[PDB]
């Protein structure tokens, strides 16, 4: 029984959230879960990984993410 998910961390400096996500799951769900845990909508936040602002349809696989990678979240302009 593999083991389909990787670990990701999303942080904004204060709020830090740990995710277990599939390589093939769109990051929309992670971005939505993080924003909405803030009581915000996905589109009020920007998510950064490797000099790139992540878009909702991208997967960890599209971005070559690795187990234990970190996503930076910040206020204003998504998505």
């Amino acid at each position: 029984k593999p083991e389909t998910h990787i670990n990701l961390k999303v942080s904004d400096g204060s709020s830090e959230i740990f995710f277990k996500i599939k390589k093939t799951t769109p990051l929309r769900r992670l971005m939505e879960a993080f924003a909405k845990r803030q009581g915000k909508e996905m589109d009020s936040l920007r998510f950064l990984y490797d000099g790139i602002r992540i878009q909702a349809d991208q997967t960890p696989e599209d971005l070559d993410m690795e187990d234990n990678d970190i996503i930076e979240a910040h206020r204003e302009q998504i998505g």
Binding site: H5, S15, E16, I17, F18, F19, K20, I21, K22, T25, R29, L30, E32, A33, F34, R37
Partner: peptide
């Protein structure tokens, strides 16, 4: 759980 992921804080 949330759709097909899990998260923790």
């Amino acid at each position: 759980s949330y759709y097909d992921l899990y998260y923790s804080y």
